[PDB]
Design goal:
The structure is cut from a larger assembly and holds 3 copies of chain A (37 residues), 2 copies of chain D (232 residues) and 3 copies of chain F. Chain A has 37 residues and is mainly alpha-helical. Chain A has 1 helix and no strands. Chain A is elongated. Helix content of chain D is 16%, strand content 31%. By secondary structure, chain D is of the alpha+beta class. The longest helix of chain D is centred in the middle third of the chain and has 12 residues. In chain D, the strands form 3 sheets. A 7-stranded antiparallel β-sheet of chain D has the order 2-1-7-8-9-6-3, covered by helices on one side. In chain D, strands 4-5 form a two-stranded antiparallel sheet. Chain D has a two-stranded antiparallel ribbon with strand order 10-11. Chain F is mainly beta. Chain F is flat, with a radius of gyration of 18 Å. The termini of chain F are far apart. The chains are: A mainly alpha (37), D alpha+beta (232), F mainly beta (74). At the A-C interface, helix 1 of A face helix 1 of C. Strand 8 of chain D pairs antiparallel with strand 3 of chain E, so a sheet runs across the interface. It is classed as protein transport.
Chain lengths: 37, 37, 37, 232, 232, 74, 70, 70
Amino acid sequence: PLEIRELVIKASVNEQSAIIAACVEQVLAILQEKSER
Amino acid sequence: PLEIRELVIKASVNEQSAIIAACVEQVLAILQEKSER
Amino acid sequence: PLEIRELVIKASVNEQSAIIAACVEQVLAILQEKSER
Amino acid sequence: ALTKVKLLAYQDKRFENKLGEFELPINPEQFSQSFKVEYNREQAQGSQRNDPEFKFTKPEELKLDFTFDGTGVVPVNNGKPGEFHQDVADQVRVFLDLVYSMNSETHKPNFLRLIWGDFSFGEKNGFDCLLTDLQINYTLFDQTGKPLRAKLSTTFTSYVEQNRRVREEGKQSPDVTHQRKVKAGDTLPLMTHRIYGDPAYYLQIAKVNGLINFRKLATNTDLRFPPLEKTQ
Amino acid sequence: ALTKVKLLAYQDKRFENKLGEFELPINPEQFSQSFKVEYNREQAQGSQRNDPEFKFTKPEELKLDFTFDGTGVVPVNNGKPGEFHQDVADQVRVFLDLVYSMNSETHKPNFLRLIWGDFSFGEKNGFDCLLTDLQINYTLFDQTGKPLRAKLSTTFTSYVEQNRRVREEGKQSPDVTHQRKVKAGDTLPLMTHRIYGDPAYYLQIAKVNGLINFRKLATNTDLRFPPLEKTQ
Amino acid sequence: KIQGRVKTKGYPDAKVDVLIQLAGVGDRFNGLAYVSGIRHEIVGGAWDTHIQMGLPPQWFYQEVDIIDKPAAGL
Amino acid sequence: IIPRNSLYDVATFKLLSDGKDITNDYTVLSITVNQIVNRVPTARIILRDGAAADETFAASEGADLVPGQE
Amino acid sequence: IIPRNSLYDVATFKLLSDGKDITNDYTVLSITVNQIVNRVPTARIILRDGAAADETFAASEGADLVPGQE
């Protein structure tokens, strides 16, 4: 993302972190685009 | 979804595409329902 | 979540349910926090 | 005398209303039992080793294999001369009806108890369980199509009721009342530490028992240790 | 007389309209059958062991292997002297047409029933099924290209209709009416507990049957136990 | 005009409201960039930083509700 | 939490539609019910249906699950 | 980026609460800090806690991590 507050916070210490990040850029792009004329 | 602008865009060409789609219908249903009285 | 209407509805009967729940608390926390000054 | 394995079928979840029993025609050669405990394994940063926390104990697992044979070379243990086992289908039928099919009054399979004579699993003489896995192999047939040998493999899981589970865990904590006798060498703060884990409560204990001087105790006094308040 | 395995092909889901049958030229040496039950295995935190809840029973599975051979050394079981099996392609063709291809009137493959003489799977003499897996290996050929031996491996799954499934589960519950005769040693609260699971209903039962004194029962009385109301 | 985000390893001397030089990305993005924000993350012993460049184009009053409702919501 | 005097722990449910019990006439997969303060109660029901060989939805064409029923 | 005259590259941190260093008194899992222009600085701290056998949260009951402290 182009923002730092839209990054996912990491809470675990013992080891799929690159799928909870791809499934977050997709939702924010589906949701932002929904606001333009 | 019942809309075409709520579909997830596919950007890869070499091969879990059916989990980034189920985790997007769930969020939109949790979020829409949050707006009705 | 602290709410009952923010819980994901379960529709299947034959068997990854703990990844569609972690990828939903992350989006709602990224989205709520985006509204405070 | 040779003893045989028995499977008892019950309808009640307290194991009081017996429905039936099945006896094996040939004892198994061996069986296996499995145990496991679950801990929390999160670790702090740049730390050498760890001290895991307890989460829970899982139900035990049991594995068994046995055989039905009807070609007329295995004797029947009833004392009659000239008798050998010759009917596989009847045994398969009664076994499946007892351990597998749905009960018409409870809408689920029956509760099982496994017993082998003088065998002991632990502190008990039986295994209370439910069937989870079963496989049958038919390897020999008659000229009319009826089977002459069957091999069975089964997996069972452990079952125990709520009311009984909380009674087996006789949890003793500062949630109950204690009583202790004073013997040679005892002091009040050390007894308080040995019951509560903290000596600081000693001044309260002396007040509960009416002790004027609590630094010189007599050696036949019985002291009461009340529980702690539920929320502080 | 030697009996052979038969596969019956039906069009109706109630298994009434028979379309055809296929008979194996060589019986299989063995086959296998598989069963399974599903439970809920969630546990409370800090608890020793558990008491799982029942979810459902899954359909059974069946595995079979057999062979077609046409080199002229396996006799044909028809009583004629000098006859041996010599045509593999015809058998493969009729088999695939019967069990695999789509039906032009139903738009799907046919329903199958497996029968072997006097064999019994359980409480029935046949297996009602659908084909899910098949593999063929051709290992010997003629100088013109036509095959002389084929080996087949098949996997079938169990099939049973809705209407019939709910009738096989003859669910008996406090949803129906019961009738009981009074015999020596019976008391009303104990009978009520044995039918409803709760003695507290006894005062209602006495009113349904017109009992003035319900602490001294006669020993030929037939009592009716009505069902419970659907929602409370 | 141009907005962006960069992730690198732990950088103790990171500060906002300064300039950095961005290179190696073609003629159309090279040059001096203005830092708007910083995030530090330390998870399980690892340390990395994120540097955000550029500002958003919307006004402050267009993103938040800073006026009450009519009739005071009664 | 488990009611006292339960001899078996099999959980059961019942779905009535205009007074008629239709639990065992269809294949029911899931049920969810929400009761929250200051909101309207809600329920969601998921059934299995559809068959490509028959080219129809049989329970959809019935008269028990159409909008407007109790 | 790595500071000059670093003999080892072990990364360290320190968490003070009302002037007292409490880094090695608890089990720290993660720390995140955000400094953005036109916004209020933020930090989030994740510690390991809880034990079902003891039926309490020991660091929650302490006096170092309660709302209102520096």
